[PDB]
Symmetry: C3
Subunit: 209 residues, 3 copies
């Protein structure tokens, strides 16, 4: 009757000679119905909600910074980062200040319910990635806001910008023209409130396990 | 090897002094791979499918009426409903005839696969919320239809209207102009059939547990 | 403390006199946190990822061909295929060369993370169904590409075409006009690489169980 572990090593594959187990800070809370697999780093005070799936078995590594949250049904996965010659595929590798990642999720970042960040991708600190939104082959700057159902594919979202709900951004020209987050923007304080809440949820939930 | 309960209390937090466990009608069926947490009310004959996540740990309470269904990977969650003074945040509280809710899902409502209703939100009786659709900060009337991939954010959808597939409705002006459901509309009988089916699935599945 | 099986029979219902258990090739890998229910056929070398839900309890049967993959949070489900007279509802039945299915997923097909194929539907061989995409009441040909967040509802996508990211195709006229996949198209080699990877992941993961 379905006996198993939800935090585990990635399997041996032609691009993964030696398996890795997730490296998770004692202060992070991983829901029992979340799945965390392979070459993953999870930082302090991170909340991982039911049904999230963080799978570092193809592209690796996948890093989630401190005080960030990975909400219900969020998926983190990436395109192959090493070839057949054990050759790093640089096109599928993201570089975040001297360190290489398949997926890099910064500090104080919110991955809201049912969103997905697929590598190669980087999401900078204090950014809110909206409900059902999508990031793939992109670098989202810090202090950004992806409204619900927006997407960034193959682009760089400059620091401090936002993507209106439903908008799919596929070109650098359009990413260059995004609106700026200002004090009066409707999602201007959303991330700070969410981060506050989720740090407190992680602690509350750690006291139930 | 991952030992746990999928129906459980919310954690103690600064806004939740005392934990609550879900209140679920004996005739509802909660799939073993669904997650139901915290201040939740689930009505009679409700079917909750694999991978759904109903989490009342921030905004609360979350109510699902009789004969409604919460399909695979559907997420129900809400913005904080109480502040730091144990102060009710009225902007994040929905009012459904004398009673206050973070998320209110009426009777005979279908939350189709991978949709999401995030509070503050109310969905009126006999409404079909389409596959992958999204409701957030909105009141959807009764006898409505959100086609697949449609969304209602920050609006009121009048009774008897529908939102074409893919359409993101963010303004009251646009919500005011939605088309009416008529006998010949393609989704006119969709909800009644779905409700019929899911009430019967709940009973069938209850006989397997 | 939540004791259960993730691969199981569908329940007895008015349209399902006798329950069926999934028929899964020994070489397929079904993640322990995936759910597979009812009248399902899973072919060889298929990888089913965490949080996927394949549920054949309404419309049936649901078939997934050899060397195909059903990624994280993907949902497969279908509209009722038999009435009250045990009457086959031909409108909700798809025909794939002499055999009838509620959902037919061909060989070497990739159902990428958080996508969904809802029957009646057929997806032809070597097609990539993008992240968060949607197929419902449609026949997607072989060698197609649904980019991330695209959708096909009520149409036939001819062989060798693609749907740009975010595009919702609801009419045969628009499906007739889709662009062709060519050697230089950005997703032209995507499916073959994904299929290669997932066949190898299935084998790797089978060696961990
Ligand atoms: Zn992937
Ligand atoms: Zn939420
Ligand atoms: Zn369905």
């Amino acid at each position: 009757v379905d006996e198993f572990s939800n935090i585990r090593e990635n399997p041996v594959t032609p691009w993964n000679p030696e398996p890795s187990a997730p490296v998770i800070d004692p202060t992070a809370y991983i829901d029992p119905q979340a799945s965390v697999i392979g070459e993953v780093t999870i930082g302090a005070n991170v909340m991982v909600s039911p049904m999230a799936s963080i799978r570092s078995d193809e592209g690796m590594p996948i890093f989630v910074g401190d005080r960030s949250n990975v909400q219900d049904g969020v998926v983190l996965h990436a395109l192959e980062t090493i070839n057949e010659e054990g050759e790093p595929i640089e096109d599928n590798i993201v570089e975040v200040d001297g360190k290489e990642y398949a997926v890099y999720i910064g500090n104080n970042v919110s991955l809201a319910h049912q969103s997905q960040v697929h590598g190669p991708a980087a999401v900078g600190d204090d950014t809110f990635i909206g409900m059902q939104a999508f990031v793939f082959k992109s670098k989202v700057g810090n202090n950004c806001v992806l409204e619900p159902r927006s997407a960034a594919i193959g682009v760089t979202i400059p620091d401090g910008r936002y993507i209106p709900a439903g908008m799919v951004v596929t070109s650098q020209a359009e990413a260059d023209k995004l609106p700026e987050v200002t004090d009066d923007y409707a999602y201007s304080h959303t991330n700070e409130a969410v981060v506050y809440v989720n740090v407190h949820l992680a602690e509350g939930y750690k006291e139930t396990s």
